[PDB]
Amino acid sequence: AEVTQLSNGIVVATEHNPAHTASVGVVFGSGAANENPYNNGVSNLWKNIFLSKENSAVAAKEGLALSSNISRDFQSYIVSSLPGSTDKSLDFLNQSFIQQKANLLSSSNFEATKKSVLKQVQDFEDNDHPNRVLEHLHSTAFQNTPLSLPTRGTLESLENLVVADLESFANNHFLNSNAVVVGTGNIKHEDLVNSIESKNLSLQTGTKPVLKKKAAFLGSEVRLRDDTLPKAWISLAVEGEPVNSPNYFVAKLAAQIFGSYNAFEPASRLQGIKLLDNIQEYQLCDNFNHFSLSYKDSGLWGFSTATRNVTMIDDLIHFTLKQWNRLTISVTDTEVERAKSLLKLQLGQLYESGNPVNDANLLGAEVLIKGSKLSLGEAFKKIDAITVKDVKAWAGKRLWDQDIAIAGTGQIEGLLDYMRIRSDMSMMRW
Amino acid sequence: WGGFSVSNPTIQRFFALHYLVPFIIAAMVIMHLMALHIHGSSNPLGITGNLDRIP
Numbered sequence A: 001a002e003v004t005q006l007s008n009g010i011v012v013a014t015e016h017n018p019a020h021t022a023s024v025g026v027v028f029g030s031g032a033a034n035e036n037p038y039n040n041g042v043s044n045l046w047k048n049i050f051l052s053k054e055n056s057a058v059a060a061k062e063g064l065a066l067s068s069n070i071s072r073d074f075q076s077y078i079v080s081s082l083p084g085s086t087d088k089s090l091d092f093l094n095q096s097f098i099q100q101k102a103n104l105l106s107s108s109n110f111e112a113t114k115k116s117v118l119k120q121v122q123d124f125e126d127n128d129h130p131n132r133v134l135e136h137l138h139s140t141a142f143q144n145t146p147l148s149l150p151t152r153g154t155l156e157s158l159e160n161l162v163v164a165d166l167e168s169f170a171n172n173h174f175l176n177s178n179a180v181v182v183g184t185g186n187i188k189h190e191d192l193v194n195s196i197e198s199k200n201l202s203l204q205t206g207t208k209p210v211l212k213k214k215a216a217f218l219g220s221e222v223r224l225r226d227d228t229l230p231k232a233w234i235s236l237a238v239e240g241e242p243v244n245s246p247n248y249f250v251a252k253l254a255a256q257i258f259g260s261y262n263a264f265e266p267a268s269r270l271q272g273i274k275l276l277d278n279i280q281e282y283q284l285c286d287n288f289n290h291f292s293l294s295y296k297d298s299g300l301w302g303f304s305t306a307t308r309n310v311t312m313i314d315d316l317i318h319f320t321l322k323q324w325n326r327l328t329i330s331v332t333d334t335e336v337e338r339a340k341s342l343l344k345l346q347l348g349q350l351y352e353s354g355n356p357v358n359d360a361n362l363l364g365a366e367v368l369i370k371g372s373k374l375s376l377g378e379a380f381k382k383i384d385a386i387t388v389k390d391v392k393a394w395a396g397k398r399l400w401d402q403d404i405a406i407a408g409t410g411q412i413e414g415l416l417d418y419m420r421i422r423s424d425m426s427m428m429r430w
Numbered sequence B: 001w002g003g004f005s006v007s008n009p010t011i012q013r014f015f016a017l018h019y020l021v022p023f024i025i026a027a028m029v030i031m032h033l034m035a036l037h038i039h040g041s042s043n044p045l046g047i048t049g050n051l052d053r054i055p
């Protein structure tokens, strides 16, 4: 458990633990939330040439493995080494992001990569209905606002993208003040920071990105009815918490109370979740899962679900929203306590997997926003300190009689109108 | 009439009948709503309503 971050000319962040391999990468503070409607998908395209057969063979000769991830707030390019080769990873990083960042964009490479992210993003829209729905949830929830842009980009902005768009983006966002270099694995801080302060040369230092306009939640829906699909997939959310919200953890705990479910897993049917008494009688769904998604400016708190019970979708939604009503008025001590324990377990399994590439992404994203990483033991202190009173005060502000955002696809004829769903965000009282 | 002309018998039985028939109308309204329910309302376009219902 370590967090050593220090700024030379660039900002260097590491977290070392004797494991096996080491992962080095640069993580930029700009993602799909920084694109336009019209160059949407430029980051995903950058990712895909960085992993192209040409660049990927040059790394595999050296015994290096490549990894990249496009998100909303950020963007990361990562090389995993075998831990004494922690220097030959920094060679491949700079040989790409200074030298080859004019050789990767060759006409034959770009056209074969663009053709591959087109088959890629098309395949997504055709078949991945849960993530497709969740992506459209962000699209309508945050419409005409940076968080609405999908991470993979749209088929139409993608096929109209040229080399100059990659260039213009790279020249405005792959800057020094919008970068953090991250090392996870087992390698020391002073083992890496010296290999970085070895070579100087700043490259476009002093240049800031471009500013924008703030993200906002708009209560709304997008309904992607398709009667030929064998199920209905729906996601429903309120405006949640940004990272570095006081209620960052209260929100995450609230989502753990209702948790996630899988009708076919015997153990899942037995969880201490009151909602399960309602939904199992007539089998109202195959699965659901609650989430508290947090970004820089905003977040989404809600749930997603999939079902073949297409004539009782209204009972699914009704029982789920009646449970959420309880958070404001009647959530019990032992529900909160169950959530604490399970939130710790899952937050643990995230922050300490046996895979440094995940560690890098979690470290990178955190330090880009607040300039530091809160340690796992520090989180548990915050989690344990949450009372029933906290959850109630949170839910009464975020959940009770608040606008929602809805998205769905498949057989959603039985998903009732907006106002019916929205009325269930509260209860009648004297 | 209950006699030779419209008289007391007539008005007393017409009150009794006036009280009754509203309840038969009520039962016929239920039969009216039963037939309405199996096919639903029509609409101003004169075509199917099946593609877009609201509660």
Ligand code: HEM
Binding pocket: B029, B032, B036, B040, B041, B042, B043
């Ligand atoms: C006490 C009398 C009646 C009651 C309470 C009644 C009630 C209703 C109700 C609630 C509806 C649905 C809403 C509407 O379309 O307005 C309806 C539909 C209808 N009623 Fe009546 N009704 C009465 C008398 C009649 C009469 C006298 C006729 C015709 C001779 C009639 C013909 C219809 C028809 C054809 C419809 C369907 C209209 C459509 O959907 O296009 N009703 N009625």
